[PDB]
Each structure stands twice: as C-alpha cells, then as structure tokens.
Amino acid sequence: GDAVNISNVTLNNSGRYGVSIGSGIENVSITNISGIGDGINSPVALVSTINSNPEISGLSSIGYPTVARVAGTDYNDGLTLFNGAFRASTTSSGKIHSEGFIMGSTSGCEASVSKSGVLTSSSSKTSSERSLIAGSSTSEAKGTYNTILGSLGAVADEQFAALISASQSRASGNHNLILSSYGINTTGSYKVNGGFEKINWELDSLNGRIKARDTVTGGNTWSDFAQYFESLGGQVIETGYLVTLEKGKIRKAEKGEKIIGVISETAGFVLGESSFEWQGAVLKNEFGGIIYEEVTTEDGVKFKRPLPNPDFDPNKNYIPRSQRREWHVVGLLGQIAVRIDETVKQGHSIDAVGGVATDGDNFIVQEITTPYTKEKGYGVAIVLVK
Amino acid sequence: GDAVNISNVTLNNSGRYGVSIGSGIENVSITNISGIGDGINSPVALVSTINSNPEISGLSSIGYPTVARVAGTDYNDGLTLFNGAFRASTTSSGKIHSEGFIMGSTSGCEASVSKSGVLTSSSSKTSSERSLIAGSSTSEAKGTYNTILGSLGAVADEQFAALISASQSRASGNHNLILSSYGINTTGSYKVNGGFEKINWELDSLNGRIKARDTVTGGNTWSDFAQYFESLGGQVIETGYLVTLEKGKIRKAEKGEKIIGVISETAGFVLGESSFEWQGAVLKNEFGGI
Amino acid sequence: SEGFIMGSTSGCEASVSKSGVLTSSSSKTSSERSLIAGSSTSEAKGTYNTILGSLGAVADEQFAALISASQSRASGNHNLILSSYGINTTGSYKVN
Numbered sequence: 092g093d094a095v096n097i098s099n100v101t102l103n104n105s106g107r108y109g110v111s112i113g114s115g116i117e118n119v120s121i122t123n124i125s126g127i128g129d130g131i132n133s134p135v136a137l138v139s140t141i142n143s144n145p146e147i148s149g150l151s152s153i154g155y156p157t158v159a160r161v162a163g164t165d166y167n168d169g170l171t172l173f174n175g176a177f178r179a180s181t182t183s184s185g186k187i188h189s190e191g192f193i194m195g196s197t198s199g200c201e202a203s204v205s206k207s208g209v210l211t212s213s214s215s216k217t218s219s220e221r222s223l224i225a226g227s228s229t230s231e232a233k234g235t236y237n238t239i240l241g242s243l244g245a246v247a248d249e250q251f252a253a254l255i256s257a258s259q260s261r262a263s264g265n266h267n268l269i270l271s272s273y274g275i276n277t278t279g280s281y282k283v284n285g286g287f288e289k290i291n292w293e294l295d296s297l298n299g300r301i302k303a304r305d306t307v308t309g310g311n312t313w314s315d316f317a318q319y320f321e322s323l324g325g326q327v328i329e330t331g332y333l334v335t336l337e338k339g340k341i342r343k344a345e346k347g348e349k350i351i352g353v354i355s356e357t358a359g360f361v362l363g364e365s366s367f368e369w370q371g372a373v374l375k376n377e378f379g380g381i382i383y384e385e386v387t388t389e390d391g392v393k394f395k396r397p398l399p400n401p402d403f404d405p406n407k408n409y410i411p412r413s414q415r416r417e418w419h420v421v422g423l424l425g426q427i428a429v430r431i432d433e434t435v436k437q438g439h440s441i442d443a444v445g446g447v448a449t450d451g452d453n454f455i456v457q458e459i460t461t462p463y464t465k466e467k468g469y470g471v472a473i474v475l476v477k
Numbered sequence: 478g479d480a481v482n483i484s485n486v487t488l489n490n491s492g493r494y495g496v497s498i499g500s501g502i503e504n505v506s507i508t509n510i511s512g513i514g515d516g517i518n519s520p521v522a523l524v525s526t527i528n529s530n531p532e533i534s535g536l537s538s539i540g541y542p543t544v545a546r547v548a549g550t551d552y553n554d555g556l557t558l559f560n561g562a563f564r565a566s567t568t569s570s571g572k573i574h575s576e577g578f579i580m581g582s583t584s585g586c587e588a589s590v591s592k593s594g595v596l597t598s599s600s601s602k603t604s605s606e607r608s609l610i611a612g613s614s615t616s617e618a619k620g621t622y623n624t625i626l627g628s629l630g631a632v633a634d635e636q637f638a639a640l641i642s643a644s645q646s647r648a649s650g651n652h653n654l655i656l657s658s659y660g661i662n663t664t665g666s667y668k669v670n671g672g673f674e675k676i677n678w679e680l681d682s683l684n685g686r687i688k689a690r691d692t693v694t695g696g697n698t699w700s701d702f703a704q705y706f707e708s709l710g711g712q713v714i715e716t717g718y719l720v721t722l723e724k725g726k727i728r729k730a731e732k733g734e735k736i737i738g739v740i741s742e743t744a745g746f747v748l749g750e751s752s753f754e755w756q757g758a759v760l761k762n763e764f765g766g767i
Numbered sequence: 768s769e770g771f772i773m774g775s776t777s778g779c780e781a782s783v784s785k786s787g788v789l790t791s792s793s794s795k796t797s798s799e800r801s802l803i804a805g806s807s808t809s810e811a812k813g814t815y816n817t818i819l820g821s822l823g824a825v826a827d828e829q830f831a832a833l834i835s836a837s838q839s840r841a842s843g844n845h846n847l848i849l850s851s852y853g854i855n856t857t858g859s860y861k862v863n
C-alpha cells in the first residue's frame with residue numbers, strides 16, 4: 092500500500108509496533124499518534140518506518156521503549172519530519188529544491204539546488220551545492236561550498252568562496268574568503284581578502300604571505316627591527332647589552348670590536364623565529380633558499396611544495412628558538428635601550444666594554460633614560476642603532 | 478487533561494480565551510483554529526497556553542487582541558511551533574536530539590546533542606553543544622561553540638574552535654579559527670590560522686602577534702622601514718627633509734651633523750605608532766620591555 | 768512573522784523581520800537581516816549581523832559580526848571580531 096494518511100490515532104496497549112510502514116513506500120503522513128504500552132508483551136516502537144520518507148508530527152507515548160524508529164534510527168522522544176522543498180516564516184520565494192529551504196526571508200529568495208539554503212535575507216539566490224546565505228540582501232551564491240553572511244550585493248561564484256560582512260563584492264577564488272569589505276572583486280586561491288574599492292590586505296594560506304597595500308605596524312613606544320642570533324657557548328645575554336660575533340655566534344662586544352646590535356626585549360619586527368617548525372625541516376639550497384616541487388592536486392590546484400628534508404624526525408618534540416636559552420633577539424636597527432657607563436653623553440657616540448656602552452664612535456645617544464650609578468654599575472640610554 | 482488534539486476549529490464570538498491549555502500539560506496539538514471576537518465582551522487571546530510545549534499551526538483570527546499567548550508571550554499574528562527533534566527537506570539522517578535539527582541535508586547528517594544543528598550538508602556530524610554545520614561535507618563538530626562553514630573533511634573538536642572555507646582540516650585550539658585552508662591541524666588558543674598542508678599564517682589574538690611562514694609585504698613603489706620620532710620644539714618638518722637629533726628630538730640636519738633619516742610619507746613598515754592605546758598605559762622595565 | 772528560533776534554549780528571541788536564532792541559549796536579535804548560531808548570552812541589535820560560536824557577544828552596528836568570540840562587542844561599520852576575549856571594537860571595515 093501507498094499514499095496513506097494516519098492521523099489522530101490513540102493506541103491503548105495495541106501492537107508491539109504501533110504504526111508500521113513497510114519498504115519501498117513513497118508517500119505516508121503520520122500525525123497525532125499517542126500510545127500506551129505498559130500492558131503490552133514486549134513492545135518495540137510507537138511508530139516504526141523502515142525508510143525515511145513518510146512525514147511525521149505530534150508523536151507521544153508512555154511504555155514504548157522507542158517513540159519513533161525511522162530508517163534504523165531511534166528518535167526516543169519523537170520526531171518532526173518533513174520531506175521536500177521547505178519554507179517557513181517568509182513573505183515570498185522563488186525556486187526551492189527538495190533539498191533546499193528558505194526561512195525568515197523576504198522578496199523572492201531562492202534556493203534552487205541540492206543542499207542550498209537561505210536564511211533571514213532579502214532577494215538572495217543560491218544555486219550553489221552545499222551552501223548557506225544568511226542575514227543578507229541582494230546576494231547570490233553560484234559555486235559550491237559557499238557561505239555568505241551579513242552581506243549586501245555579494246557574489247560567491249567559485250568553490251569554497253565565501254563572504255562575511257561584505258558589500259558590493261565578489262569572491263571568485265578557490266577557498267577564497269572576503270571579510271569586512273566594500274566593492275572588491277577577488278580571485279586568488281586559498282586567500283583571505285579585505286578592501287574598500289580595491290583589495291587592501293591579503294592573508295595567503297597557500298604560500299604563507301601577508302600583504303598590506305599601506306603600512307604594517309608592530310610593537311610599542313621604542314621598538315626595533317630585529318633578528319635571532321645564537322650565543323657563543325650558549326650563555327644568556329641580558330637585554331641592553333651590545334653584542335659582537337665570534338665563530339658565527341654572539342657575545343658581549345669588547346673594545347675596538349664591531350657592534351652588530353643590542354639584546355632586545357622590544358622588537359616590533361623580527362626575523363628567523365622558526366615559530367612553525369624546526370628550521371631544518373625543509374630542503375634549502377646553498378644560499379638558504381627553499382627548494383620546491385610543482386604539484387597539481389587531484390582536484391586541480393596548481394601549487395609548489397617545499398621539499399621535505401629526509402633528516403627530519405617527526406618524533407622529536409619541537410621546542411622553538413623563542414623558548415631556547417642560547418637564541419637571542421638582537422635589535423639591528425631602531426631606537427634601542429642600551430646599558431651605559433659614566434662616560435656616555437646624550438648626542439654622542441658609543442663604543443663597547445664588556446657589552447656596556449662607553450664613549451666612542453658608533454651610533455647616536457638619543458637620551459639617557461636611567462642615569463649611571465656606581466651602585467648599579469650601569470645606566471640606560473635610548474641609542475639610535477643603524 | 479493531557480494528550481489532546483484540537484484541529485479545524487472555528488469560534489464565532491465564543492470565549493475570551495479561545496483555546497486554553499493549562500499548566501503541567503506535556504502533549505497537545507492545536508491546528509487550524511480561526512476565531513471571530515468583535516462581539517465578545519473583552520476578548521483576550523484566540524489561543525492561550527501557559528506552558529510552551531503544545532504544538533501549534535494554522536492560527537488566524539479577527540477581533541482578538543492576541544492571536545497566540547504562549548508561555549507569557551504574545552505572538553500577535555500567530556505561531557508555527559514544533560517541539561522535539563526536527564528535520565526538513567533532507568534525504569536521510571542519523572540521530573537528532575530534541576534540541577537539534579537537520580535541514581536541506583543529505584546522507585546521514587546527525588545532530589546528537591542539545592543546541593546542535595546541520596544545514597545544507599552531506600554526511601556531517603555534530604555532537605557539539607551550541608554548534609552549527611552548514612554548506613559542508615564529510616565534517617564533524619565535537620567540542621562546544623563550534624561553527625563549520627563551506628568545508629570539506631573538517632573537524633572542530635575544542636571549545637569555540639571553528640572552520641570556514643577549509644578542506645581536510647582540524648581546529649583543536651580554544652577559540653581557534655581556521656580560514657581558507659587545506660590539510661592543516663591547529664592547536665593554538667585565540668589563534669586565527671591558514672595554511673596549505675602546513676600552517677602558513679597566524680593571527681594571535683592572545684599575545685598580539687602576526688606570523689607569516691614566507692614574506693610580509695607593505696607599501697608602494699619606493700618605500701622604507703621607518704620609526705616615529707618627536708620634533709624639537711614641536712615643529713612640523715615636511716617630507717623630504719634630512720633630520721638629526723638634539724636633546725632626544727628631531728630637527729633638520731646641519732653641516733657635519735649625523736643624518737639619522739628623512740621625513741617620510743611612504744613607509745611600508747613602521748615602528749612606535751601607539752595606534753591602540755596611550756604609550757604609558759602599560760608598565761615597562763628600565764629597557765622599555767613590558 | 769519573518770523570524771525563527773531553532774534548536775535553541777532559554778528565551779531565545781528574534782523580534783524583527785529577517786532575524787533568526789539557531790542552536791543557542793538566551794540570545795536575542797532585533798537586527799534586521801541577522802543570524803545568531805551556536806551561541807550563548809548573545810545579542811544582535813544593528814543590521815546585517817552574524818554572531819557565531821560566541822559567548823556574551825554583542826553586535827550593535829551595521830554589518831558588525833563576531834565569530835568564536837567571548838565577552839565581546841563589535842560596534843564598527845562592517846566590523847568583524849575573530850577568536851577573541853573581552854574586547855570592544857569600533858573601527859569601520861576592520862577585522863579585529
């Protein structure tokens with residue numbers, strides 16, 4: 092049998108399976124069924140359905156171990172199930188696919204393909220398989236795996252392309268996301284983008300690049316451009332000390348020696364952290380440049396991969412240079428705090444004795460910020476290092 | 478009384494409360510009720526329900542000040558209310574909690590806990606309390622406060638962990654977000670991450686750090702690395718001027734004096750903006766370190 | 768009438784046209800064209816707001832949004848907060 096309505100049914104201790112729907116049935120409606128099964132010999136389900144396309148609402152029972160068994164799944168306190176195109180709380184809508192819905196939406200919102208949906212939106216369309224549009228207006232999704240959120244006049248027309256808080260904007264890249272933007276058209280793969288009329292910033296997930304059209308800023312009050320150096324013998328060198336090199340490693344600078352910088356605690360920009368992985372995890376040429384292979388992913392993504400170093404051991408638990416003792420942030424350029432002696436004057440230059448500034452030939456003393464005292468054995472001056 | 482169906486009812490000037498459901502009632506169904514209340518002496522509600530678990534659809538009326546009062550709340554133009562597990566416009570589904578739903582979804586989408594939901598997705602599972610999965614495939618959420626959007630083979634298994642436009646990826650950090658990524662496993666707390674096979678960029682909300690595996694670029698045509706300096710006497714020094722220092726402050730450079738730089742209008746990278754707060758808002762040591 | 772509440776608990780409210788709440792507890796939207804999902808103690812009150820996977824989060828300006836945010840407020844025009852705790856934000860076209 093098929094095409095049957097079962098509504099407003101009460102079962103008082105009647106049937107181990109209360110309502111039962113067989114295999115291959117396309118169209119059944121079950122509403123308002125309530126059963127009692129205390130006095131039944133081994134009751135199973137109040138409602139039972141072998142396939143998933145009967146429609147069900149208003150189920151309650153006492154004494155049945157399962158209120159609903161549908162397509163081999165218990166819904167122990169009942170189910171509300173509708174099949175086909177769905178629409179709730181909307182004023183008007185265009186096309187709705189059987190696996191699409193429109194909710195809380197106005198003026199011709201449309202979800203025309205499988206797994207496409209529109210929420211709380213006006214005049215928005217999706218023909219994207221696996222997609223969501225929400226909190227939006229004049230918007231369209233037409234690729235696949237698209238989400239559009241809190242957006243006006245926004246288009247996502249490529250796979251995994253997405254827009255959040257965007258106006259008059261189009262995301263056309265593979266895995267391409269636009270945020271907090273007005274009037275931008277975007278195309279990169281694995282890119283996060285923002286802009287006003289033109290693209291203004293980019294987070295490139297593919298190559299690991301960060302781009303700003305204008306400035307990048309970091310740091311506080313007096314800051315510097317810095318680089319990680321390794322200390323000779325693995326010593327700790329405190330901040331404010333002038334360092335030199337010996338056997339490729341840093342130590343406190345002595346008389347007549349070249350000052351390469353100052354141990355720094357206030358870098359805005361730093362190089363050579365190895366924050367992600369161990370430094371030798373990737374193959375590098377003789378100049379330190381990464382060696383690559385061109386890979387074309389099964390899908391179609393055409394990228395280049397850094398070559399793995401065979402000597403790399405994924406067992407070894409990586410501790411970054413920022414946590415190691417021997418590795419020091421050394422300020423190379425900028426306004427830097429330096430340990431001085433009694434001989435150092437504002438507006439003058441400095442040489443070094445035991446890593447401590449003495450009157451000399453290098454750089455410029457900007458201002459003494461902590462005057463020398465016999466008891467401390469040093470003062471502190473801001474030195475403009477270049 | 479309990480377990481009652483009220484359907485296809487028309488009230489022509491009959492009852493101040495049209496349909497009334499008392500306290501402690503678990504199971505009532507109300508469909509297709511239409512009332513007229515012009516000629517009633519002080520009508521209140523077409524439908525009235527003291528608790529929230531009767532189910533309601535197809536309500537209309539004229540002359541009633543409230544079409545529906547449910548659990549002390551007016552729904553003045555009617556309500557459509559279902560309770561329990563919900564499913565609409567989907568081909569198949571696994572487990573659905575009474576406070577879970579599956580919509581516009583295919584092949585065994587499951588929402589097994591309170592406040593878990595799946596939209597427009599295939600073979601996706603959430604057991605995350607307070608979560609959403611949408612526009613997705615082969616995906617799983619299992620922490621709390623997880624959203625997964627436009628994603629394939631994506632896992633969120635920590636609190637507030639989230640993924641948008643991500644492939645074959647896992648976010649395991651506290652408040653940890655992955656964007657526009659393929660094949661990355663992520664763990665930091667208050668981190669935003671992107672990558673292809675390996676993590677390639679990070680926005681650290683916790684410590685205020687920005688990290689790129691490759692390059693950071695800024696600026697235009699001819700650019701420079703720069704720093705904020707304060708002018709002696711508070712003068713304005715125009716761009717293109719060579720500056721020196723005197724009493725820790727900049728002025729135009731003179732003969733034989735040390736040139737420290739040029740007033741710049743085209744910096745790509747700059748230090749010491751104090752863009753966020755006043756410079757002295759935080760305690761610093763003798764070397765300027767926080 | 769153009770709002771909904773689904774998979775939600777304790778007094779979730781969607782009081783305006785095109786406002787909706789999903790899988791959330793004690794969350795309110797009075798934002799026209801908005802969504803709150805996977806959330807708790809949260810409120811949207813501007814326009815074009817989405818709040819996702821958030822606790823004690825407020826969006827009270829147009830296109831302001833929060834994802835994976837705690838005890839946080841986005842008040843800027845097209846202003847987005849990510850992966851954050853205890854921040855109040857105000858810039859226009861900013862991600863914070």
Ligand SMILES: Nc1ncnc2c1ncn2[C@@H]1O[C@H](COP(=O)(O)OP(=O)(O)OP(=O)(O)O)[C@@H](O)[C@H]1O
Nearest residue numbers: 365369370371402403404405407408409410411412
């Ligand atoms: N061959 C390796 N494979 C994987 N990890 C490694 C390897 N060698 C070292 N590490 C990791 O790097 C950390 C210390 O680095 P180590 O000094 O041993 O080598 P390195 O190449 O000198 O590193 P760095 O130059 O960063 O100091 C350790 O925590 C260890 O886990």
Ligand SMILES: [Mg+2]
Nearest residue numbers: 321415417418
């Ligand atoms: Mg080493």
